[PDB]
Amino acid sequence: AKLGSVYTEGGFVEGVNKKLSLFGDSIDIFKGIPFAAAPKALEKPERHPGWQGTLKAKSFKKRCLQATLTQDSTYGNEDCLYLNIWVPQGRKEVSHDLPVMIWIYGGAFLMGASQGANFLSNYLYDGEEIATRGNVIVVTFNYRVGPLGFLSTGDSNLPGNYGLWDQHMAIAWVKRNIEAFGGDPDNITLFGESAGGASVSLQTLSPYNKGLIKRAISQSGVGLCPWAIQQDPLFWAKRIAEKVGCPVDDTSKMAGCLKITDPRALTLAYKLPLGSTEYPKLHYLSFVPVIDGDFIPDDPVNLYANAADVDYIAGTNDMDGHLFVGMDVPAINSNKQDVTEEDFYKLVSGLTVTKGLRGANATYEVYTEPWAQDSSQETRKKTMVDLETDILFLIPTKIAVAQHKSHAKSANTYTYLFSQPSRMPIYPKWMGADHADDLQYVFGKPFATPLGYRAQDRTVSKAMIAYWTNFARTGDPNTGHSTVPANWDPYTLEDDNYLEINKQMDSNSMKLHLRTNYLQFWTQTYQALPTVTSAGASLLPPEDNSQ
Numbered sequence: 001a002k003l004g005s006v007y008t009e010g011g012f013v014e015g016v017n018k019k020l021s022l023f024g025d026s027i028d029i030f031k032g033i034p035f036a037a038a039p040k041a042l043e044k045p046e047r048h049p050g051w052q053g054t055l056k057a058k059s060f061k062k063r064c065l066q067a068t069l070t071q072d073s074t075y076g077n078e079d080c081l082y083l084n085i086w087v088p089q090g091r092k093e094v095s096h097d098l099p100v101m102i103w104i105y106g107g108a109f110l111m112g113a114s115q116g117a118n119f120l121s122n123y124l125y126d127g128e129e130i131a132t133r134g135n136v137i138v139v140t141f142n143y144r145v146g147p148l149g150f151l152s153t154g155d156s157n158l159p160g161n162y163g164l165w166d167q168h169m170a171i172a173w174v175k176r177n178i179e180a181f182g183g184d185p186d187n188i189t190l191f192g193e194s195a196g197g198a199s200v201s202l203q204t205l206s207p208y209n210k211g212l213i214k215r216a217i218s219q220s221g222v223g224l225c226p227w228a229i230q231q232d233p234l235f236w237a238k239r240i241a242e243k244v245g246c247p248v249d250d251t252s253k254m255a256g257c258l259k260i261t262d263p264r265a266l267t268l269a270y271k272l273p274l275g276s277t278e279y280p281k282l283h284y285l286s287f288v289p290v291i292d293g294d295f296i297p298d299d300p301v302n303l304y305a306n307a308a309d310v311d312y313i314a315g316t317n318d319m320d321g322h323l324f325v326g327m328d329v330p331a332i333n334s335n336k337q338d339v340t341e342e343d344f345y346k347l348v349s350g351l352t353v354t355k356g357l358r359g360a361n362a363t364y365e366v367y368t369e370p371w372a373q374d375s376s377q378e379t380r381k382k383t384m385v386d387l388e389t390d391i392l393f394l395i396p397t398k399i400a401v402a403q404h405k406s407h408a409k410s411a412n413t414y415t416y417l418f419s420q421p422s423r424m425p426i427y428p429k430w431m432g433a434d435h436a437d438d439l440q441y442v443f444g445k446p447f448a449t450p451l452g453y454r455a456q457d458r459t460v461s462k463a464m465i466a467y468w469t470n471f472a473r474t475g476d477p478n479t480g481h482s483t484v485p486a487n488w489d490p491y492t493l494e495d496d497n498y499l500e501i502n503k504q505m506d507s508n509s510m511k512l513h514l515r516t517n518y519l520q521f522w523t524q525t526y527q528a529l530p531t532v533t534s535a536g537a538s539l540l541p542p543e544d545n546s547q
């Protein structure tokens with residue numbers, strides 16, 4: 001069948017119907033529907049007022065204003081709040097009451113576009129494969145990124161989180177209109193990776209999404225990740241106002257200035273210092289969400305209450321840290337480059353600055369227990385990847401599933417570990433899954449563009465698409481429109497069970513206790529060490545001028 005012209009809160013919308021077989025199977029595809037009005041620089045989004053007549057939603061609109069790679073603070077403009085929809089259709093009748101999956105893209109909160117772009121190893125986000133292979137409606141949209149989406153003074157002058165408001169507006173529009181297209185409003189599921197994985201998390205915790213989200217999936221990213229929350233907003237708020245001529249040490253005037261400063265200037269003033277220097281950096285992504293007064297009204301760890309009736313999946317790739325540690329210690333497969341013990345200590349120190357050399361010393365100690373030694377420079381390099389994977393993805397993720405499992409009411413909880421080896425020619429033979437390697441499988445690339453894909457890739461992709469969509473349908477990965485390769489057991493604090501996802505999907509894919517001892521170190525021992533919180537009175541309550 002064909003949807004045709006659908007009437008939504010704003011007016012009529014028309015997309016294209018792509019035929020997929022000689023038997024009626026088609027797929028309606030709408031692109032460019034506005035969920036909000038063109039946002040004003042550093043200002044929250046308003047609902048879109050509507051339009052007269054029909055909207056021809058046939059192509060992705062401008063992605064949000066962001067920087068290219070080197071110069072160009074160009075990639076879109078402020079008018080970018082658009083969403084796209086993919087509705088699988090039969091032949092007999094039109095689809096109705098279908099699960100809805102809203103995708104939130106990553107890109108370190110600084111880059112990103114619904115139009116399958118702004119990402120590295122993988123980037124295209126076409127919902128056709130998922131929609132059609134799982135009989136699910138797939139949605140994608142744009143949310144403000146960069147200074148323009150997350151710049152904040154840390155007070156009423158500039159709260160920040162504008163990018164999170166946009167994501168919320170999308171989710172809201174979908175809640176209110178998705179039935180027009182054949183979706184079931186009470187079966188909205190969110191999924192995302194990296195910053196998108198964290199956004200999904202933060203969106204389930206926000207009181208604003210009280211009863212909008214039914215289920216959620218976070219991939220390589222969660223709200224408790226050290227990188228998801230900016231502890232000291234003003235810090236970079238001043239520095240930005242430094243590059244662009246604005247009254248730095250006067251929040252009010254500074255905020256007024258910025259809000260009127262040129263978007264492209266504001267965008268560009270933020271250049272990631274990925275250069276030739278080893279000072280603690282290369283993971284100082286200043287523009288990320290913050291704890292403001294309302295959207296994220298407290299530390300994410302205390303907001304769990306909001307996600308108690310939300311079915312949740314959270315997972316990690318066995319070497320998520322590889323991509324990042326490489327930027328610090330550029331020894332991937334550099335056989336003619338060796339990592340010394342002090343090299344490891346040096347990385348540790350930088351990673352544990354807030355706890356002094358005591359923290360650095362405890363960490364180095366726990367992490368260097370194994371006897372593979374110098375001779376096994378592989379093991380050394382191996383542990384350096386474990387370290388950043390644990391710190392940036394795994395630990396935060398374990399705490400989030402446990403936390404969710406314990407405070408769950410009716411919600412289900414499932415976690416996973418994706419380990420399909422990266423066959424990137426420029427990485428060492430020991431490589432497992434790196435950050436983002438999951439994307440191609442989740443979005444069904446091995447099927448969409450099979451050229452260059454082994455069958456194993458189609459095996460994995462068939463499984464992941466099956467798990468995600470079954471879950472999006474029943475809250476259970478093992479029950480839905482598709483056949484699951486191996487049973488995925490619901491999480492328990494008792495077993496700490498995780499499905500290892502790869503080509504060998506069988507009864508033995510369900511495993512227990514992934515790096516329990518390190519969870520312990522980071523959460524008990526380490527945490528107990530005195531912090532260099534030492535900031536005098538530069539603490540959250542003192543000297544914030546009553547917000």
Ligand SMILES: *[C@@H]1O[C@H](CO)[C@@H](O)[C@H](O)[C@H]1NC(C)=O
Nearest residue numbers: 355356357358359360361362
């Ligand atoms: C470890 O760090 C502590 C200070 O936190 C210091 O007293 C000790 O000498 C250090 N030991 C080594 C072996 O580096």
